[PDB]
């Protein structure tokens, strides 16, 4: 417990560049362990309370990794406490790029914490073709309508995220090591959300006869379909914007679309 906390202090420190990935493991391993699962999250409460947005910026990139990989119990940890990062409302920083980005970025993560309030079960990491480990494609009709609507609120927030920044990202408003570090988890999640929803549809149309709730499907698909055009423009502009051309920074969206709409309306 004490030795594990020391690893967090060294890794999540003020060193401009991104932390060592190997050091992150030892910190983010202690979560499936049913020994305590508290000491890790204790230090992640007093530090966001601080006013500075330098250490806090790098603090919110580790949570974004643990939430996309770790057990869903980790998500449940920061639910019993209603307050998370709301104290960052109304703040003032040096450059205009800082505060303008923080004010919206801080609320994007709040939605991710609110994601567990409704869906609870782990979503971002349950394969594409699986029934047992996945709790989305084979959920209750009531839960199925809720888990998709929750993902919509998170997906639409990506457009809202770029709204306050305008155009898309702008390298001029994102030219530091701390800022570019937090861009990768946002994109990896964005493509993840896009993947796990359309992957459900691949299993949904297959399992139509063995189900009970056809009415609560078409509105979910229709709303998600319109988001494609919004997401295509998001990355098309990002591609034009000068940035590191990594697979995790600019994935390819257009893959499932013409053979999804037609096959779904047949059931209705």
């Amino acid at each position: 417990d004490s030795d594990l906390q020391k690893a967090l202090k060294k890794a999540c420190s003020v060193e401009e560049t991104a932390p060592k990935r190997k050091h992150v493991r030892a910190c983010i391993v202690y979560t499936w362990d049913h020994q305590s699962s508290k000491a890790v999250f204790t230090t992640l409460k007093t530090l966001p309370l601080a006013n500075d947005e330098v250490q806090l910026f790098k603090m919110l990139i580790v949570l974004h990794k643990i939430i996309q990989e770790g057990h869903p119990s980790a998500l449940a940890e920061a639910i019993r406490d209603r307050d998370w990062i709301r104290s960052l409302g109304r703040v003032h920083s040096g450059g205009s790029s800082y505060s303008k980005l923080i004010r919206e970025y801080v609320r994007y993560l709040v939605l991710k914490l609110d994601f567990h309030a409704h869906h609870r079960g782990f979503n971002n990491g349950t394969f594409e073709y699986e029934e047992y480990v996945s709790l989305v494609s084979v959920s209750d009709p009531d839960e199925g309508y809720e888990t998709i609507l929750d993902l919509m609120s998170l997906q639409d927030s990506l457009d809202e995220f770029s709204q306050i920044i305008f155009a898309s990202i702008q390298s001029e408003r994102r030219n530091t090591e701390c800022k570019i570090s937090a861009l990768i988890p946002l994109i990896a999640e964005s493509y993840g959300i896009y993947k796990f929803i359309t992957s459900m549809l691949r299993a949904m149309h297959r399992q139509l006869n063995d189900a009970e709730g056809d009415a609560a499907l078409q509105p979910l698909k229709e709303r998600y379909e319109l988001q494609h055009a919004r997401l295509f423009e998001f990355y098309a502009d990002c591609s034009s914007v000068k940035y590191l051309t990594t697979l995790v920074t600019i994935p390819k969206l257009p893959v499932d679309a013409p053979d999804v709409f037609l096959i779904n309306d047949v059931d209705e």
């Binding site: 417990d1 004490s2 020994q35 305590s36 508290k38 000491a39």
Partner: protein
Amino acid sequence: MSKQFVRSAKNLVKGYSSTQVLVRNATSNDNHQVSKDSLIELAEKSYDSADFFEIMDMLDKRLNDKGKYWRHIAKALTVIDYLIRFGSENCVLWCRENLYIIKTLKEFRHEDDEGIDQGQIVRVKAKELTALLSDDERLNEERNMNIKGRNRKG
């Protein structure tokens, strides 16, 4: 008598905290045992995180040190026990979570150099420490006695 002045000089040069000095002072080279009054001062000043986490960490490390340092092991257990009774609420809450770790300090065998079981004194004192922590209800009763007792006087 003479080694005490030298020990204190080394601590001042390095610049250890107030807690680390008192812990090192308890683990003295002399044969004379530690005083009970000194345990009271530590118990009262064992609330802060910066102090408490250091106190628990140091005393745990004092249990090993080296083969020759046998006095440093017995004195550590004496301090830990008193920090549970008249210590603070934060002391108990942390010990409750770390009870799983503290529990495994009963079979502590050791042999310095010549051939004298120095862990006999350690084993006896540690046995009492585990017995008190094993009973959760007993710990709660001790808290009420120290809290109310302190309020009775002031």
